[PDB]
């Protein structure tokens, strides 16, 4: 049960933004220029 709970928390953490506009970085990359996309991507990477 402990292993399952930890793994479920880890997988749920992929649904957060950590301050970026969107949780999924596919959308970030699909509607932003790389110089401006990298700003969001940095926050998302730190959060993960």
């Amino acid at each position: 049960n402990q292993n399952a709970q930890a793994l479920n928390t880890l997988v749920k953490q992929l649904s957060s933004n950590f301050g970026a506009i969107s949780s999924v970085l596919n959308d970030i990359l699909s509607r932003l220029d790389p110089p401006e996309a990298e700003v969001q991507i940095d926050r998302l990477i730190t959060g993960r």
């Binding site: 699909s30 509607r31 932003l32 220029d33």
Partner: protein, 49 residues
């Protein structure tokens, strides 16, 4: 619109203008008005004038 080469300012905020043709949106608004030249910069978020 991007390649019209006749628009003084075209800056986008949420998106990238070059990638804009590839997106897909729920709905879009369109406002139109006439202003002078020295307050176009006032049309921006977090701006006072």
């Amino acid at each position: 619109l991007y390649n019209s080469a006749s628009f003084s300012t075209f800056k986008c905020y949420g998106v990238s203008p070059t990638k804009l043709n590839d997106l897909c949106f729920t709905n879009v608004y369109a406002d139109s008005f006439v202003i002078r030249g020295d307050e176009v910069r006032q049309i921006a978020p977090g701006q006072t004038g």
